[PDB]
Scaffold this motif. Structure first.
Motif, mmCIF file in Angstrom:
data_model
loop_
_atom_site.group_PDB
_atom_site.id
_atom_site.type_symbol
_atom_site.label_atom_id
_atom_site.label_comp_id
_atom_site.label_asym_id
_atom_site.label_seq_id
_atom_site.Cartn_x
_atom_site.Cartn_y
_atom_site.Cartn_z
ATOM 1 N N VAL A 1 -1.006 5.881 -3.079
ATOM 2 C CA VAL A 1 -1.216 5.715 -1.611
ATOM 3 C C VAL A 1 0.033 6.225 -0.912
ATOM 4 O O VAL A 1 1.148 6.078 -1.402
ATOM 5 C CB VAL A 1 -1.605 4.245 -1.243
ATOM 6 C CG1 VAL A 1 -0.628 3.358 -1.618
ATOM 7 C CG2 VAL A 1 -1.833 4.098 0.275
ATOM 8 N N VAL A 2 -0.198 6.965 0.174
ATOM 9 C CA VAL A 2 0.869 7.449 1.057
ATOM 10 C C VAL A 2 0.697 6.794 2.398
ATOM 11 O O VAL A 2 -0.425 6.753 2.928
ATOM 12 C CB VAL A 2 0.800 8.982 1.170
ATOM 13 C CG1 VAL A 2 1.979 9.509 2.087
ATOM 14 C CG2 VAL A 2 0.912 9.548 -0.150
ATOM 15 N N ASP A 3 1.781 6.264 2.968
ATOM 16 C CA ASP A 3 1.733 5.683 4.333
ATOM 17 C C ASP A 3 1.139 6.738 5.298
ATOM 18 O O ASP A 3 1.569 7.894 5.260
ATOM 19 C CB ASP A 3 3.139 5.255 4.724
ATOM 20 C CG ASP A 3 3.156 4.384 5.968
ATOM 21 O OD1 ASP A 3 2.326 4.492 6.881
ATOM 22 O OD2 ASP A 3 4.111 3.617 6.063
ATOM 23 N N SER A 4 0.207 6.295 6.125
ATOM 24 C CA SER A 4 -0.494 7.178 7.064
ATOM 25 C C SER A 4 0.534 7.900 7.975
ATOM 26 O O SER A 4 0.316 9.083 8.320
ATOM 27 C CB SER A 4 -1.542 6.391 7.868
ATOM 28 O OG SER A 4 -0.929 5.309 8.552
ATOM 29 N N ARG A 5 1.637 7.237 8.296
ATOM 30 C CA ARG A 5 2.708 7.864 9.112
ATOM 31 C C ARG A 5 3.264 9.123 8.443
ATOM 32 O O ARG A 5 3.818 10.034 9.104
ATOM 33 C CB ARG A 5 3.939 6.955 9.267
ATOM 34 C CG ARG A 5 3.806 5.512 9.674
ATOM 35 C CD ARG A 5 5.170 4.959 10.204
ATOM 36 N NE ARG A 5 5.998 4.211 9.241
ATOM 37 C CZ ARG A 5 5.690 3.011 8.714
ATOM 38 N NH1 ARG A 5 4.523 2.413 8.996
ATOM 39 N NH2 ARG A 5 6.542 2.409 7.867
ATOM 40 N N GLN B 1 -2.832 -0.269 2.566
ATOM 41 C CA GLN B 1 -3.486 0.950 3.111
ATOM 42 C C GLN B 1 -4.475 1.567 2.117
ATOM 43 O O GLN B 1 -5.302 2.412 2.513
ATOM 44 C CB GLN B 1 -2.444 2.010 3.509
ATOM 45 C CG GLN B 1 -1.537 1.426 4.623
ATOM 46 C CD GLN B 1 -0.709 2.554 5.270
ATOM 47 O OE1 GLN B 1 -1.105 3.718 5.322
ATOM 48 N NE2 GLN B 1 0.477 2.201 5.731
ATOM 49 N N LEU B 2 -4.418 1.129 0.863
ATOM 50 C CA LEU B 2 -5.428 1.532 -0.168
ATOM 51 C C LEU B 2 -6.503 0.474 -0.220
ATOM 52 O O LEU B 2 -7.700 0.843 -0.034
ATOM 53 C CB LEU B 2 -4.747 1.731 -1.527
ATOM 54 C CG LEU B 2 -5.712 2.056 -2.672
ATOM 55 C CD1 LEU B 2 -6.477 3.333 -2.519
ATOM 56 C CD2 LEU B 2 -4.790 2.135 -3.967
ATOM 57 N N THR B 3 -6.179 -0.778 -0.593
ATOM 58 C CA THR B 3 -7.244 -1.806 -0.540
ATOM 59 C C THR B 3 -6.585 -3.172 -0.360
ATOM 60 O O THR B 3 -5.352 -3.275 -0.177
ATOM 61 C CB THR B 3 -8.115 -1.719 -1.762
ATOM 62 O OG1 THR B 3 -9.334 -2.461 -1.504
ATOM 63 C CG2 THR B 3 -7.473 -2.311 -3.063
ATOM 64 N N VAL B 4 -7.400 -4.209 -0.402
ATOM 65 C CA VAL B 4 -6.987 -5.577 -0.145
ATOM 66 C C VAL B 4 -5.856 -5.949 -1.116
ATOM 67 O O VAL B 4 -5.979 -5.759 -2.336
ATOM 68 C CB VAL B 4 -8.182 -6.510 -0.424
ATOM 69 C CG1 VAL B 4 -7.768 -8.007 -0.314
ATOM 70 C CG2 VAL B 4 -9.378 -6.145 0.447
ATOM 71 N N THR B 5 -4.782 -6.509 -0.554
ATOM 72 C CA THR B 5 -3.725 -7.083 -1.389
ATOM 73 C C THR B 5 -3.709 -8.586 -1.395
ATOM 74 O O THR B 5 -3.243 -9.208 -2.379
ATOM 75 C CB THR B 5 -2.276 -6.631 -0.984
ATOM 76 O OG1 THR B 5 -2.016 -7.050 0.374
ATOM 77 C CG2 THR B 5 -2.158 -5.083 -0.987
ATOM 78 N N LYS C 1 -2.187 -5.380 -11.817
ATOM 79 C CA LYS C 1 -1.818 -4.692 -10.569
ATOM 80 C C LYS C 1 -1.091 -5.600 -9.628
ATOM 81 O O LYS C 1 -1.018 -6.843 -9.920
ATOM 82 C CB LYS C 1 -3.105 -4.217 -9.869
ATOM 83 C CG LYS C 1 -3.905 -3.191 -10.678
ATOM 84 C CD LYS C 1 -5.072 -2.755 -9.818
ATOM 85 C CE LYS C 1 -5.932 -1.624 -10.388
ATOM 86 N NZ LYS C 1 -5.184 -0.305 -10.381
ATOM 87 N N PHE C 2 -0.580 -5.083 -8.512
ATOM 88 C CA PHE C 2 -0.092 -5.931 -7.426
ATOM 89 C C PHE C 2 -1.148 -6.152 -6.377
ATOM 90 O O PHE C 2 -1.218 -7.215 -5.768
ATOM 91 C CB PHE C 2 1.175 -5.306 -6.745
ATOM 92 C CG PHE C 2 2.413 -5.363 -7.594
ATOM 93 C CD1 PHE C 2 3.252 -6.482 -7.559
ATOM 94 C CD2 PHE C 2 2.748 -4.331 -8.398
ATOM 95 C CE1 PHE C 2 4.364 -6.521 -8.373
ATOM 96 C CE2 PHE C 2 3.871 -4.391 -9.206
ATOM 97 C CZ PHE C 2 4.690 -5.488 -9.157
ATOM 98 N N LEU C 3 -1.995 -5.182 -6.148
ATOM 99 C CA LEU C 3 -3.075 -5.378 -5.146
ATOM 100 C C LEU C 3 -4.118 -6.379 -5.671
ATOM 101 O O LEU C 3 -4.121 -6.872 -6.826
ATOM 102 C CB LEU C 3 -3.553 -4.024 -4.553
ATOM 103 C CG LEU C 3 -4.202 -3.093 -5.569
ATOM 104 C CD1 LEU C 3 -5.625 -3.539 -6.028
ATOM 105 C CD2 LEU C 3 -4.173 -1.705 -5.098
ATOM 106 N N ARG C 4 -5.025 -6.822 -4.771
ATOM 107 C CA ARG C 4 -6.002 -7.810 -5.161
ATOM 108 C C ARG C 4 -5.340 -9.121 -5.644
ATOM 109 O O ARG C 4 -5.732 -9.737 -6.579
ATOM 110 C CB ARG C 4 -7.090 -7.259 -6.156
ATOM 111 C CG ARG C 4 -8.136 -6.365 -5.447
ATOM 112 C CD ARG C 4 -9.195 -7.361 -4.860
ATOM 113 N NE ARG C 4 -10.489 -6.729 -4.532
ATOM 114 C CZ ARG C 4 -11.639 -7.342 -4.713
ATOM 115 N NH1 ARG C 4 -11.658 -8.648 -5.203
ATOM 116 N NH2 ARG C 4 -12.775 -6.691 -4.367
ATOM 117 N N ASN C 5 -4.297 -9.543 -4.876
ATOM 118 C CA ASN C 5 -3.576 -10.788 -5.182
ATOM 119 C C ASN C 5 -3.041 -10.780 -6.576
ATOM 120 O O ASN C 5 -3.250 -11.671 -7.366
ATOM 121 C CB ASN C 5 -4.481 -12.023 -4.902
ATOM 122 C CG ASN C 5 -4.603 -12.316 -3.418
ATOM 123 O OD1 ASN C 5 -3.741 -12.980 -2.861
ATOM 124 N ND2 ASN C 5 -5.674 -11.818 -2.784
#
Ligand code: NA
Ligand code: NA
Lengths: 147, 147
Positions: free
Chosen positions: A88-92, A23-27, B73-77
């Motif tokens: 990041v906070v879940d949008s829910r 929900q923040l960026t590409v993982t 980080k964990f994001l970006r693979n």
């Protein structure tokens, strides 16, 4: 809904941690092998690299997260600065004051470690949020991606 | 004047390194004991924490400096981001393109380490300088000092 604040644990790979980061960026689709590898590489830094999570108990999923990495410097009498990242906070669960709780947990950790400051970057729209956490905006972020 | 770019070395405590940092912000009067302690704590991070210096040869003083700390980080693979910090050029040597050389050295290191981005914070006035190094401004810095 009930919320528990704590540090990231190795079992959080099954509690929607990487999904929430998305929900923040590409993982990308981070494997359990890779999750554990990178969890132990970050754990190796001890108190110099803390990831906070808030779990919502009924669902058993991570609802909010944020990280801080402590940088040792020579300036400021060989001081230490905290770099808060990956908030990041879940949008829910927006409006439940979870992001303030995350930021304050990380600021409390950095104050306790003897850092002279904490910094983070955000959108212009989120300035007022972080002002509510006692922060001020006096510089801008520059970035270069190696895409 | 002649300029040599390289990494910080333990002997740089006698070449005006801490004095040059004082042109960016407060250093205090860092002792040789403290300099060596913090040099070895940063050296311990290896390629994840690089300090670049440029020495002006005739004077034998440090003319420019900048640092980068690589954050896993964990994001970006399970990616890596470079945080460029503590960039300063001696006022005597401004206009000699030393700050670009410092920034490019640190960007080259981070690209070589497989980072997906590099970031730094600057004044609004220095945006155009960093745009010349290939960077873009799309976020702002928030800070909290524990003064
Ligand atoms: Na450090
Ligand atoms: Na790291």
């Amino acid at each position: 809904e009930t919320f528990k604040i704590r540090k990231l644990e190795i079992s959080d790979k099954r509690k929607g941690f990487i999904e929430l980061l998305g929900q923040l960026t590409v993982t990308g689709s981070v494997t359990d092998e890779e999750f554990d590898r990178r969890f132990e590489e970050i754990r190796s830094y001890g108190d110099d690299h803390v990831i906070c999570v808030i779990e919502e108990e009924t669902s058993g999923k991570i609802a909010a997260t944020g990280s801080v990495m402590i940088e040792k410097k020579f300036l400021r009498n060989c001081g230490k600065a905290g770099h808060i990242e990956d908030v990041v906070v879940d949008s829910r669960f927006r409006g439940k004051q979870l992001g303030k709780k995350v930021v304050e947990f990380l600021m409390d950790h950095c104050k306790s470690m003897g850092c002279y400051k904490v910094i983070l970057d955000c959108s212009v729209e989120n300035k007022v949020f972080y002002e509510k956490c006692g922060m001020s905006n006096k510089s801008i972020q520059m970035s270069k991606y190696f895409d």
